Amino acid sequence: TNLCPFGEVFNATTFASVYAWNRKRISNCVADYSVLYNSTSFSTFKCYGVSPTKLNDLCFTNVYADSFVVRGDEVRQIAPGQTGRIADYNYKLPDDFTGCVIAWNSNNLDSKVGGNYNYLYRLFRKSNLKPFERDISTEIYQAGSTPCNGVEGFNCYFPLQSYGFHPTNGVGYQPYRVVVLSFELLNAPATVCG
Amino acid sequence: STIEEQAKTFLDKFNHEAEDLFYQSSLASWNYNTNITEENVQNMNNAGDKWSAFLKEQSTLAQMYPLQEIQNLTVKLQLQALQQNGSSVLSEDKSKRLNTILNTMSTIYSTGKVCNPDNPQECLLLEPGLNEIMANSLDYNERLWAWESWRSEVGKQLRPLYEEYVVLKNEMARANHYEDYGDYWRGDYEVNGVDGYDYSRGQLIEDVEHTFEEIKPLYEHLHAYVRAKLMNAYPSYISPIGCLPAHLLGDMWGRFWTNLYSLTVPFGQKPNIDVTDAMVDQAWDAQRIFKEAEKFFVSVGLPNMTQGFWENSMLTDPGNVQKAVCHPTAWDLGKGDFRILMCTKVTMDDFLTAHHEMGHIQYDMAYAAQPFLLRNGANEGFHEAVGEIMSLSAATPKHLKSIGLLSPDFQEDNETEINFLLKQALTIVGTLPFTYMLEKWRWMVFKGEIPKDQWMKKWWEMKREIVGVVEPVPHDETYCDPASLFHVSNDYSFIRYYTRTLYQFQFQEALCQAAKHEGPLHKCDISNSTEAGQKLFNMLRLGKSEPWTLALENVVGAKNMNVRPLLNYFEPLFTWLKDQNKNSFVGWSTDWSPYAD
Ligand SMILES: *[C@@H]1O[C@H](CO)[C@@H](O)[C@H](O)[C@H]1NC(C)=O
Ligand SMILES: *[C@@H]1O[C@H](CO)[C@@H](O)[C@H](O)[C@H]1NC(C)=O
Ligand SMILES: *[C@@H]1O[C@H](CO)[C@@H](O)[C@H](O)[C@H]1NC(C)=O
Ligand SMILES: *[C@@H]1O[C@H](CO)[C@@H](O)[C@H](O)[C@H]1NC(C)=O
Ligand SMILES: [Zn+2]
């Protein structure tokens, strides 16, 4: 009957990259999303399947909280049935998503003078990812047909680009920390509700 | 596996690299522009060199993609914009020679200074002294001296440099499978591979010549009226049927006739509209000016400026402890960062310049969704036209009455209307013959139709035939008078101003038809009209991803330039001149010269 460690995933000093997003397994506790909804500091909370106030008096087996950093125009791609760079090559969400994403501007924390390039995103890939799949490999992406043996050359280049986050960037280019809450149902007994 | 997918991936990588690099370059240049030191210039030059080296490497990598197997129009346009090798197509020594010639011409122009032998120790440069003499002085001898002295100081030193520049640019263009450098310039308006909206590089010549043939009567009436007024001001120096002397056009070259308003005012007893006093009384500052401009722009349905614009842009003179080159410019640094750097004073001129720069910023915000290489106007004349139409709408007495800067008891009559129209015509209609003549001369020179021993002769006879301006002193072939202009000696195209002047009136007439404006066009205003705002945005957000003919059709319904809107705008002034010139001559003869005795 303890509180779920939401502060460690929401108030972490650093966030994972979008291509290497971290998944936290939260269970065996109690959770209250009322303060999370009424925080009013988040610029995006959009889901279809459960209401923010109805998911409180309803509990599941396990929950997953994925966190990463994207641009401002790239927040819309974190949603079911969406396409693009992040939806295909970085973060794929299925159509049957029972949760939604919490996004908020973080230009003051995740952007410093000169550009905060600690956040990277996968730009090219041979195919799209599966739901909840993650690819951390750094093998050189081959665009043509001639082999190049993992070196920078024609049609060969490193398949990871760093986000350039400046404090004076536009709203569509400011680092938006996205927290994705996913919920699922299995035969396991309910562990987290109060 | 085809060439299409490989080109798409290459462009996708180039976009996400060049965006960051260009953003860093622009950020360094801005930090230099708001805080000018030596280390700031060092940082700015380092960032610009990084950006240029990256661009060269990417163009080299792109040159290895055959464009003949490219099907997508957008991918083809991006690959074509990136594959412009330019100065690298020549050898190394020839490229260094060309760069040396360009820098030498730029330095000779920017550091030029000439003065009479009365005292060779004290005299001013072009910008602060010669422009003032050309604008404000009314002495024939002083203006003639300044004109001839600047010509003999600049053109005489630029003539062989400009000839070598011409032959080197011709070689560069013929190495790029172009007919000449003028063809490389005209390639900005060329559209290929699109049916119905295609455009060649001689089609532009024909369109410009046709539009100027249509303009000729209005400019002829304006020229006759200006000549009559100047002969009333200069009694012993102007002929009844002769052309206009070059040194009496209000500036060093005669590009604009704005400074002839004091000499050519229709009704001097009627004071022109000036709302600076109402701004001073109502405690208007730079922030208030820009807020009113934003309110005007959102009235037509365009989105307001972002928070970063107000937080980062320099709207006032930053004191005196630190210097800043605050010429009004609209900054599109990329990655959603738009700024305006301008020392805004509480005047009406700055009130209109604010609207101009806000129009530039709105056009920049419009096509931000386009890829990096497709973030620009439809051609080199859409940005300035979109900027000028907003100032035109803001300058009307109706808008000044609506925002409170004009009292409701103001009596808008035909006299102030004629005064404002004549000022607008001196600003606008006076530059079209000069621009057309200069671009035609440059084109004919690059095309080889003008040999070296006839440059100045053909230039001045084209002046007499087209512009109606006769040189005050006889010039032989040792002069290079065309190179005295900034845009010529610094390798800049010049037809963009003609296309801007035509497109701005096309846009204005289209929006006024969409806004259901009743009455003359010079009294039109687009404020409080979301229909015309949406019609404009439909062309704004295109960028250069579609043929400029399609972007023009998206607003005016035509696939080419149209000059009827300009005449619809200036027809009250036209009837006024037609009634005023009934007792005078309208035209000019090429035989008379100011040195003929
Ligand atoms: C993160 O810290 C802020 C400030 O103390 C607090 O208001 C917020 O509730 C914290 N986040 C969570 C999930 O508790
Ligand atoms: C302007 O530049 C100088 C030297 O580069 C620096 O010392 C100064 O702090 C700068 N001004 C501001 C406001 O930062
Ligand atoms: C060109 O590529 C873009 C990339 O998404 C695509 O949207 C567009 O339909 C393509 N055009 C053609 C004519 O294939
Ligand atoms: C626009 O309409 C509003 C409301 O009718 C009015 O207050 C405002 O003065 C109008 N502005 C212009 C420029 O017509
Ligand atoms: Zn401008």
Short mmCIF file of N, CA and C in Angstrom, two decimals, chain A residues 1-6 24-33 54-65 181-186 188-194:
data_model
loop_
_atom_site.label_atom_id
_atom_site.label_comp_id
_atom_site.label_asym_id
_atom_site.label_seq_id
_atom_site.Cartn_x
_atom_site.Cartn_y
_atom_site.Cartn_z
N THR A 1 0.83 -1.20 0.00
CA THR A 1 0.00 0.00 0.00
C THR A 1 0.86 1.26 0.00
N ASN A 2 1.86 1.29 -0.88
CA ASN A 2 2.76 2.42 -1.03
C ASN A 2 2.48 3.13 -2.35
N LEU A 3 2.99 4.35 -2.45
CA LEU A 3 2.78 5.17 -3.64
C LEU A 3 3.68 4.70 -4.78
N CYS A 4 3.17 4.75 -6.00
CA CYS A 4 3.96 4.34 -7.16
C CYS A 4 5.01 5.41 -7.47
N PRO A 5 6.24 5.02 -7.78
CA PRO A 5 7.33 5.99 -8.02
C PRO A 5 7.17 6.74 -9.34
N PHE A 6 6.18 7.63 -9.39
CA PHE A 6 5.99 8.47 -10.57
C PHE A 6 6.96 9.64 -10.62
N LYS A 24 9.92 1.85 -17.94
CA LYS A 24 9.92 1.59 -16.50
C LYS A 24 8.70 0.76 -16.15
N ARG A 25 8.91 -0.32 -15.41
CA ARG A 25 7.83 -1.19 -14.97
C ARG A 25 7.42 -0.81 -13.56
N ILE A 26 6.20 -0.30 -13.41
CA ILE A 26 5.68 0.17 -12.13
C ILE A 26 4.56 -0.77 -11.71
N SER A 27 4.72 -1.38 -10.53
CA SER A 27 3.73 -2.31 -10.01
C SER A 27 3.90 -2.39 -8.50
N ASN A 28 2.95 -3.09 -7.86
CA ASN A 28 2.96 -3.31 -6.41
C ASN A 28 2.98 -1.99 -5.65
N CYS A 29 2.00 -1.14 -5.94
CA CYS A 29 1.90 0.17 -5.30
C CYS A 29 0.49 0.70 -5.52
N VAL A 30 0.29 1.97 -5.15
CA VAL A 30 -0.95 2.68 -5.41
C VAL A 30 -0.62 3.92 -6.24
N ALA A 31 -1.54 4.30 -7.12
CA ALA A 31 -1.32 5.40 -8.05
C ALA A 31 -2.55 6.30 -8.10
N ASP A 32 -2.31 7.61 -8.15
CA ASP A 32 -3.36 8.60 -8.27
C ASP A 32 -2.99 9.57 -9.39
N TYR A 33 -3.65 9.43 -10.54
CA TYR A 33 -3.39 10.26 -11.70
C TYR A 33 -4.12 11.60 -11.65
N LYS A 54 -11.64 8.56 -15.41
CA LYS A 54 -12.20 7.23 -15.23
C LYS A 54 -11.10 6.18 -15.04
N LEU A 55 -9.89 6.48 -15.51
CA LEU A 55 -8.79 5.53 -15.33
C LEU A 55 -8.29 5.48 -13.90
N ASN A 56 -8.75 6.40 -13.04
CA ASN A 56 -8.34 6.36 -11.64
C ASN A 56 -9.01 5.21 -10.90
N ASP A 57 -10.33 5.09 -10.98
CA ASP A 57 -11.05 4.01 -10.32
C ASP A 57 -11.14 2.79 -11.25
N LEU A 58 -9.97 2.40 -11.75
CA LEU A 58 -9.83 1.26 -12.64
C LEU A 58 -8.36 0.88 -12.70
N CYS A 59 -8.07 -0.37 -12.35
CA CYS A 59 -6.70 -0.85 -12.26
C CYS A 59 -6.48 -2.09 -13.11
N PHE A 60 -5.22 -2.33 -13.44
CA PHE A 60 -4.81 -3.38 -14.36
C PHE A 60 -3.76 -4.26 -13.69
N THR A 61 -3.07 -5.06 -14.50
CA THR A 61 -2.00 -5.91 -13.99
C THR A 61 -0.68 -5.14 -13.88
N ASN A 62 -0.21 -4.58 -14.99
CA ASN A 62 1.05 -3.85 -15.01
C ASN A 62 0.93 -2.65 -15.94
N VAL A 63 1.74 -1.62 -15.69
CA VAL A 63 1.76 -0.41 -16.50
C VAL A 63 3.20 -0.15 -16.92
N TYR A 64 3.36 0.53 -18.06
CA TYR A 64 4.67 0.89 -18.57
C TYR A 64 4.70 2.38 -18.89
N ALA A 65 5.74 3.06 -18.42
CA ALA A 65 5.91 4.49 -18.63
C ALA A 65 7.17 4.72 -19.45
N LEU A 181 2.20 6.43 -21.33
CA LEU A 181 1.65 5.46 -20.39
C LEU A 181 0.85 4.41 -21.16
N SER A 182 1.28 3.16 -21.08
CA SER A 182 0.62 2.05 -21.75
C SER A 182 0.03 1.11 -20.71
N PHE A 183 -1.19 0.64 -20.96
CA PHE A 183 -1.90 -0.23 -20.04
C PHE A 183 -2.35 -1.48 -20.79
N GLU A 184 -2.31 -2.62 -20.10
CA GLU A 184 -2.65 -3.90 -20.70
C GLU A 184 -3.37 -4.78 -19.68
N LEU A 185 -4.06 -5.80 -20.18
CA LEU A 185 -4.84 -6.71 -19.36
C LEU A 185 -4.39 -8.14 -19.61
N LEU A 186 -4.10 -8.86 -18.53
CA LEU A 186 -3.77 -10.28 -18.60
C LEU A 186 -4.51 -11.00 -17.47
N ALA A 188 -3.15 -12.03 -14.79
CA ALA A 188 -2.51 -11.75 -13.52
C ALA A 188 -3.44 -10.93 -12.63
N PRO A 189 -3.35 -11.12 -11.31
CA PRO A 189 -4.22 -10.37 -10.40
C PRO A 189 -3.87 -8.89 -10.39
N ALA A 190 -4.86 -8.07 -10.04
CA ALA A 190 -4.69 -6.62 -10.00
C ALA A 190 -3.77 -6.25 -8.85
N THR A 191 -2.77 -5.42 -9.12
CA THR A 191 -1.77 -5.06 -8.12
C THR A 191 -1.79 -3.59 -7.73
N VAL A 192 -2.16 -2.69 -8.64
CA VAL A 192 -2.02 -1.25 -8.41
C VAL A 192 -3.36 -0.54 -8.58
N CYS A 193 -4.14 -0.50 -7.50
CA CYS A 193 -5.27 0.42 -7.40
C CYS A 193 -5.59 0.65 -5.93
N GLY A 194 -6.14 1.83 -5.65
CA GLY A 194 -6.52 2.21 -4.30
C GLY A 194 -7.66 3.21 -4.25
#
